[PDB]
Amino acid sequence: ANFRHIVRVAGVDLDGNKQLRWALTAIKGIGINFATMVCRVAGLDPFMKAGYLTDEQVKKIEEILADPVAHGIPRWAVNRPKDYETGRDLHLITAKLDMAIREDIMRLRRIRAYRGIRHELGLPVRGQRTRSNFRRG
Amino acid sequence: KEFRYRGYTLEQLMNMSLEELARLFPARQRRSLKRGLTPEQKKLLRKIRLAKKGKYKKPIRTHCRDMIILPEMVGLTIYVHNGKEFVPVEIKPEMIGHYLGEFAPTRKKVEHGAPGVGATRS
Amino acid sequence: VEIPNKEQILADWEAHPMRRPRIEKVTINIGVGESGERLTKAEIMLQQLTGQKPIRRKAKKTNRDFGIRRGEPIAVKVTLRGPKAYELLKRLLAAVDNRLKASSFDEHGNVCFGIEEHINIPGVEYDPEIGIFGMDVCVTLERPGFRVARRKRKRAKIPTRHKLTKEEGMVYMMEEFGVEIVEG
RNA sequence: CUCAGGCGGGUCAGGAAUCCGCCGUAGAGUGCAAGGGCAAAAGCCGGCCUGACUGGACCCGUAACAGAGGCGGGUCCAGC
RNA sequence: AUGCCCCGAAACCCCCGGGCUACACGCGCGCUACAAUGGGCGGGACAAUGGGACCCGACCCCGAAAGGGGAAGGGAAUCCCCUAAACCCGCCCUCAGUUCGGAUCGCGGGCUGCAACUCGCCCGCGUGAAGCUGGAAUCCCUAGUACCCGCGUGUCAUCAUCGCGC
């Protein structure tokens, strides 16, 4: 059939000689596990070479990514299990994920929490020792 | 934009009881609330409730750095001990569910000077 | 915000048909800032978004701080007029919420804004050639007889009575399409 | 076609990148000192070209009035 | 344990909070890796030393995992920790900063503890920094020894890249 060398899914170009799992892995916000989950939900064999995808299959993948939970993805396998604002289960991809993480760090810095102070200073935030390691200069 | 926590406004959060607040809060805060509050934390809650009702006009100082902020504590200044002094913290809506000690830093930022004689093998 | 003169200035627009102005041109600028393949990407983007050719606006004077050299093609721009301009303005104004800052209006009833990402019938076809998305859009109004100051022959100057103002421009925008805000 | 400079507006963009309006007698530019002259231009942007040519006449300045080799300039006839 | 000197309402005794956990930098000893003498997936085999009463806990039920509820036997040659990994077979990856690498951070769910932000540990999804074999110099080891790979225990309410053994 029409074997596309390059396929664009969710606004990111995917390889044509790579399996669907690792091809979807190319999008920030999705890893091997979640890519396999998405393929299984869509009903596509995870091992098919990306490039044989049709327009309908690509649109189905797009819809699954848009609303993974409503399509059968478990509520505990999503990127944002409990949104701070809405209070729902969300999974963010690329730009929206970056904005969400930036907003979280900005909220910390705004409330003046210890983790926000450490974020702005650029030092470890999770309680590491900074005497012998973390030497950036 | 209007502040919202898990899709609930500030008035709804105030009206919600302790169990629902624990459900909303993360795992650590929910576990702390489930286990309960220590007597010192209970005294702190009594002081805050009196201050809110308007019969306590004096500043509120405490050593309880492990206390979690509740919605009813919003709109008050609490002086949290940091080992030496009682630094002031103004409770804001976005700070609910956080530990009261996170906003009272203990150590000081380091401005490293010239290394000493023994700082190197020379 | 609130305009206090809406009622009597409505009486005025209806009483004098020739006092009704129109959008003579909408200008869209893409400040790429560098003469690279991103410039060509923006050129093709605006080509397929608007439908007419781009313009290579060169840089005046040289500045090493911004990594530019005098005469280098830096940014691009496009001017839209007519019913097609009306349609493009409508779709662009719908792209973002149909709200305009009330302070953004100029002294002569000229308004404009900026969009930091294509959202207007945008088309997800951005991975091939996109990344410099972003566009300064400014609209110019005019009462009909303003070509007197543009024609070469017998050029003259329009009086102050016959030219637009901030309030008239915002009320015209409100009446035609979209709403204003209090910008704080 | 009109400049410098300025006021108000606009995503990154900030004093300064590119843009939209208004004011703007030249406060810009004109290869280089200074003076003079230049705004539908002598300035900025383009199209075509090589009169930065050949054979000659007369006249002014260096050198007022008042003499001049050499040189610079101006007004013309003819050819292409 | 102890001579002299010193503090002796203080350097003595208790309680709360903080610190010993900071961090431009130099060093010791280690873990993880810089991949095919491999990574992932499903499957198939094999130990020993020791410990166990607010203790080890089979077995059953719920949960995707961490984990939760009931509970037999064991005062231990009778019951439990305890069906280890390296290794073997089939498939994908085929030399690439990659299906190598697992730091660094986001959200969410738990355990211990009177108390988990300074300052604990565990699991899910997402993220994906140096590192592509190492200069001068320098260290251990002669046989079930070195290398490789896991397990028991001491510390322990929780926490083991640690010491002692297998």
Curated annotation (Swiss-Prot), chain A:
It holds the Pfam family Ribosomal_S13. Gene3D superfamilies: 1.10.8.50, 30s ribosomal protein s13, domain 2. Signal peptide: none annotated. GO terms for biological process: translation. Keywords: Ribonucleoprotein, Ribosomal protein, RNA-binding, rRNA-binding. One of its GO terms (cellular component) is small ribosomal subunit. GO terms for molecular function: rRNA binding; structural constituent of ribosome. InterPro entries: Rbsml_uS13_C, Ribosomal_uS13, Ribosomal_uS13-like_H2TH, Ribosomal_uS13_archaeal, Ribosomal_uS13_CS. Belongs to the universal ribosomal protein uS13 family. Located at the top of the head of the 30S subunit, it contacts several helices of the 16S rRNA. In the 70S ribosome it contacts the 23S rRNA (bridge B1a) and protein L5 of the 50S subunit (bridge B1b), connecting the 2 subunits; these bridges are implicated in subunit movement. Part of the 30S ribosomal subunit. Forms a loose heterodimer with protein S19. Forms two bridges to the 50S subunit in the 70S ribosome. This is Small ribosomal subunit protein uS13. It comes from Pyrococcus furiosus (strain ATCC 43587 / DSM 3638 / JCM 8422 / Vc1).
UniProtKB/Swiss-Prot annotation, chain B:
PROSITE patterns: RIBOSOMAL_S19. The keyword Repressor does not apply. Keywords: Ribonucleoprotein, Ribosomal protein, RNA-binding, rRNA-binding. One of its GO terms (molecular function) is rRNA binding. The keyword RNA-binding applies. One of its GO terms (cellular component) is cytosolic small ribosomal subunit. InterPro entries: Ribosomal_uS19, Ribosomal_uS19_CS, Ribosomal_uS19_euk/arc, Ribosomal_uS19_SF. It comes from the Archaea. Disulfide bonds: none annotated. GO terms for biological process: ribosomal small subunit assembly; translation. Belongs to the universal ribosomal protein uS19 family. Protein S19 forms a complex with S13 that binds strongly to the 16S ribosomal RNA. Part of the 30S ribosomal subunit. This is Small ribosomal subunit protein uS19. It comes from Pyrococcus furiosus (strain ATCC 43587 / DSM 3638 / JCM 8422 / Vc1). The gene is rps19.
Curated annotation (Swiss-Prot), chain C:
It comes from the Archaea. InterPro entries: Ribosomal_uL5 (IPR002132), Ribosomal_uL5_arc (IPR022804), Ribosomal_uL5_C (IPR031309), Ribosomal_uL5_dom_sf (IPR022803), Ribosomal_uL5_N (IPR031310). Keywords: Ribonucleoprotein, Ribosomal protein, RNA-binding, rRNA-binding, tRNA-binding. It holds the Pfam family Ribosomal_L5. Part of the 50S ribosomal subunit; contacts the 5S rRNA and probably tRNA. Forms a bridge to the 30S subunit in the 70S ribosome. GO terms for cellular component: ribonucleoprotein complex; ribosome. The keyword Ligase does not apply. GO terms for biological process: translation. The gene is rpl5. One of its GO terms (molecular function) is structural constituent of ribosome. Signal peptide: none annotated. Belongs to the universal ribosomal protein uL5 family. This is one of the proteins that bind and probably mediate the attachment of the 5S RNA into the large ribosomal subunit, where it forms part of the central protuberance. In the 70S ribosome it contacts protein S13 of the 30S subunit (bridge B1b), connecting the 2 subunits; this bridge is implicated in subunit movement. May contact the P site tRNA; the 5S rRNA and some of its associated proteins might help stabilize positioning of ribosome-bound tRNAs. This is Large ribosomal subunit protein uL5. The keyword RNA-binding applies.
